[PDB]
Amino acid sequence: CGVPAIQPVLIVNGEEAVPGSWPWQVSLQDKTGFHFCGGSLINENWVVTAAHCGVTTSDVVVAGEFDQGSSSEKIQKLKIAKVFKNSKINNDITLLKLSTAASFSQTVSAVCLPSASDDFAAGTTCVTTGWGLTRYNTPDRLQQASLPLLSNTNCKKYWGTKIKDAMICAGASGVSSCMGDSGGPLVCKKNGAWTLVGIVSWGSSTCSTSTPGVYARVTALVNWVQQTLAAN
Amino acid sequence: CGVPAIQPVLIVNGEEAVPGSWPWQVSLQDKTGFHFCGGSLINENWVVTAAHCGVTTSDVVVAGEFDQGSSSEKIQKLKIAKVFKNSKNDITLLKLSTAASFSQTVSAVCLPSASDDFAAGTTCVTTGWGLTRYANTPDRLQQASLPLLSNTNCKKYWGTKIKDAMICAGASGVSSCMGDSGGPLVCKKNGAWTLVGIVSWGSSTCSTSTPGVYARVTALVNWVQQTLAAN
Ligand SMILES: *C(=O)[C@H](Cc1ccccc1)NC(=O)[C@@H]1Cc2ccc(cc2)OCCCCOc2ccc(cc2)CCC(=O)c2ccc([nH]2)C(=O)N1
Ligand SMILES: *C(=O)[C@H](Cc1ccccc1)NC(=O)[C@@H]1Cc2ccc(cc2)OCCCCOc2ccc(cc2)CCC(=O)c2ccc([nH]2)C(=O)N1
C-alpha cells in the first residue's frame, strides 16, 4: 500500500493533481451520480470515509476518477455491501464494505493504515486531496494540497474544546479543506509510504485558509477499523 | 402542552427520534400523499406551519406518524377546512375540518408569550422528515439539538435577509433541510416544549456550518392567538 504506480507531483488554494496519482481517492456518489463525499481505499473490499457522510448501501463507491466531468475515464463503480459507522460524530469515521472487490491498477490501489502507536508529529507536511470547493464551485478534476499537521494544543487556539484527542488538525497554512472534501484522505509520508493520518471532517464555515481544518485522527481509530475488518 | 407522553431522548446530521415523542409534529401531505412540509399542532383544531409551504385545503395534516414507511401506526389523516395566511412572515395557520383526537402520540406544543426571552446559546430542538442529506429522505421522524443564534451573529452569515421577525439556529453541525419547512423549532421553557421557531429557510445545500432561519414565533403569536379567537 501507499506507493502509487503514478507518482504524485507536489480544497481552497490547492493544485490540480497528476491524474491517478492518488489511487486510493474514491468518490462517494448517490444513485443519481452526485458526489457528496470522498473516501479512501484501504484494500480490495474496504473504503474508509467520514461518518457524517451518512453513506448507505444505495450509494456508490467510485474509484479511478480524475475528472468527474469526463466519461472517457477507466473508472469503477463499486456497490456497497455493508456500512460500518463508528458508534463512539463521534469519531467521524465510517467503513464501507464493497459487494465486489475493486480491481487494483495504475489508478486504483490502497492507502496504508497507520499503527495506532504511529507518531505523525505536529509540523510534518502532509497532503490532503479531493473534489471539494476550490473557492467558497465544485471542481471536476481531483485537487491536492500540502499542509502541516497541528498539535492539538495549538489547534484548540482556534477551535477550543471542540478538538478531541481522536481528532487531528492540519492546515492554517494558506490552503484549506472545504465542502465536498469530507471523508477524503489526509496522508503523510511514513517510511516511504503514504499512510492515512486523517479523514476530512470539519472546519471553517468559509474554508478560511488561515484556520486549521479538522480531521478524524486515524491512529486513534485504527484499532476500531481492524476490529471491524476481522469480524467481517 | 409541550409535555409529550412518550418522553424525548436527546434534517441533516440529526438522529432518529423516539416514536411518538414529538406528538405535535404533523406531516403535511398532498392529495397523492407525498410529504411536502412539516407543521405543529397547537390545539386539537389548529396547525401552525410555513407560508412558503403553499398549503391548501386539498392538502392533508397527518398526526401520530413516526415512520411514513410503516402502516401499522394509528395515524390520523386530518382534512383542512381553512388556511389563514399572515398578511405581509413565513407562517400560515391551518384550521382542521375535524378535531384531532389527542393521545399518547398526538397532542399540542405550547405557545410562547410575545415578551418571552429565548436567549442566544439556548439548546433547542427542531424535528422533521426533511432530507437527511442534500432520494435522501427518511421514512422515520428526525430530531436535532441546536443552539439559538443572536440575530447579529446570524447576519454574519445572512446579512440584511435577516429580519427582526426571524430567528436563526444551528450552524453547529446539523441543519434543517428540504421537507422540514413549516415544522417546529422548540425550546423547553418551565419544563415544557414551546414553539419558538417555524422552519423557514437557510443554506441552499443544507450546510451544517450555516445557521438555519426560522420564523420567530414571539413576533407572530399575537396574530396567531388573535386569528384563533376571531375564528
Ligand atoms: C465536508 O465536505 C465538509 C468539509 C470541510 C472541511 C473544512 C472546512 C469546511 C468544510 N465538512 C462539513 O461540512 C462538516 C460536516 C460535519 C463534520 C463533523 C460533525 C458534523 C458535521 O461532527 C463533529 C461536530 C464537531 C464540530 O462541531 C462544530 C460545531 C460548530 C462549529 C464547529 C464545529 C462552528 C460552526 C462551524 O464552523 C462548522 C459547523 C459545521 C462545520 N463547521 C462543518 O465543517 N461541517
Ligand atoms: C423547506 O422545507 C425548506 C427547509 C429548509 C430549511 C433550511 C435550509 C434549507 C431548507 N426551506 C426552504 O427550502 C426555503 C423556503 C423559503 C422560505 C422563505 C422564503 C423563500 C423560500 O422567503 C423569505 C426568505 C428570504 C429568502 O431569502 C433568500 C435566502 C437565500 C437566497 C436567496 C433568497 C440564496 C439561495 C438560498 O440559499 C435559498 C433560496 C431559497 C432557500 N434558500 C430556502 O431555504 N428556501
Which one-letter DSSP state was computed for residue A19? T
Return the closest-CA partner of residue A212 out of A172, A166, A180.
A172
Sign, Cα dihedral of B77, B80, B81, B86:
positive
Give the closest ligand to the alpha carbon of residue B134. 2
Look at the block and give the residue holding cell 429522505. Answer: B137
The rounded distance, in Å, linking the Cα atoms of B224 and B93 is: 8
What dotted CATH number matches A23-110+220-230? 2.40.10.10
Confirm if B201 and B215 have CB atoms less than 8 A apart: no
Please report the beta strands in B6-147, taking only residues with DSSP state E, as ranges in sequence order: 15-16, 25-29, 35-41, 46-49, 60-63, 76-85, 92-96, 123-128, 142-147
| C-alpha span between B214 and A130 (Å, rounded) | 33
Same fold for the pair A11-22+111-219 and A23-110+220-230: yes
Residue B202 C-alpha, separation from nearest chain A C-alpha, in angstroms: 14
B98 grid coordinates? 375535524
C-alpha A178/C-alpha A36 separation (Å) is 12
Task: Please give the Cα distance from B39 to B195 (Å, whole number).
Answer: 11
Q: For residues A36 and A64, is the Cβ–Cβ distance under 8 A?
A: no
For chain A, domain boundaries: 11-22+111-219, 23-110+220-230
Distance from C-alpha of B142 to C-alpha of B149, rounded to nearest angstrom: 21
Q: Which CATH number does A11-22+111-219 carry? A: 2.40.10.10
B202 lines ligand 2 (CB under 6 A): yes
| CA closest to A34 among chain B residues | B134
Separation CA A166–CA A128 (nearest Å): 18
For residues B58 and B40, the answer to whether their CB atoms sit within 8 Å is no
What is the rounded (10 degree) CA torsion for A147, A152, A156, A158? Answer: 0
Task: State which amino acid sits at residue A153.
Answer: T
Alpha carbons A170 and B155: distance in angstroms, whole number: 29
Task: Find how far residue A214's CA is from the centre of its chain.
Answer: 12
d(CA A153, CA B4): 43
Cis, bond preceding A90 (omega within 30 deg of 0): yes
Q: At A56, phi and psi to the nearest 5?
A: -125, 170
User: Looking at this protein, which amino acid is placed at residue A230?
Assistant: A
- What are φ and ψ of residue B158, in 5° steps? -110, 0
Q: CATH number for the B11-22+109-218 domain, one of 1.10.3720.10, 3.30.450.20, 2.40.10.10, 3.40.50.720?
A: 2.40.10.10
B90 lines ligand 2 (CB under 6 A): yes
Distance separating alpha carbons of residues A180 and A133, to the nearest angstrom: 6
Interface mutation vs chain A, best among B139, B155, B168, B209, most A CBs within 10 Å = B209
Q: C-alpha angle with apex B184: B179 to B189, nearest 5 degrees?
A: 160
In the DSSP assignment, the letter for residue A208 is -
Asked if B133 and A54 come within 8 Å (Cβ–Cβ), the reply is yes
Using CA atoms, how far apart are residues A110 and A114, in angstroms rounded to an integer? 13
State the count of interchain CB pairs (< 8 A) between A and B.
24
A35 in active site: no
Phi, psi of B151 (to 5 degrees): -65, -35
Query: From the CA of B39, which ligand is nearest?
Result: 2
Q: Is 2.40.10.10 the CATH number for B23-108+219-229?
A: yes
Q: Identify the bridge partners of residue B35 per DSSP, sorted by sequence position.
A: B29
Structure-block grid coordinates of residue A80: 456497497
Q: A-chain residues within 8 Å CB-CB of B207?
A: 179, 205
Half-sphere exposure of B224 (CA within 13 A, CB side): 30
Nearest CA-CA partner of A86 in A96, A78, A76: A96
Q: Is A92 a catalytic residue?
A: yes
How far does chain B reach from its first CA to its final CA, in angstroms? Answer: 21
Q: Please indicate the experimental technique that yielded this structure.
A: X-ray
Looking at this protein, which amino acid is placed at residue A35? H
Residue identifier of the C-alpha nearest atom 25 of ligand 2: B161
Distance CA A22, CA A142 (A): 9
The CA distance from B43 to B107, in Å, is 7
Alpha carbon distance B18, B142 (integer Å): 9
Set of cell numbers at residue B40: 405543529
Tell me the backbone φ, ψ of residue B138, rounded to 5 degrees. Answer: -80, 145
Q: How many CB atoms lie within 10 A of CB A86?
A: 18
Distance of CA B59 to the CA centre of its chain: 17
Closest to B128 (Cα-Cα) out of B92, B171, B179, B89: B179
Say if ligand 1 is within 6 A of residue A117 CB. no
CA B43 – CA B223 distance, rounded (Å):
16
What Å resolution does this PDB entry report?
2.2
Q: Is the dihedral of CA B226, B25, B167, B136 positive or negative?
A: negative
Mutate to test the interface with A, among B12, B16, B133 (most CBs of A within 10 A): B133
In single-letter form, the type of residue at position A64 comes to G
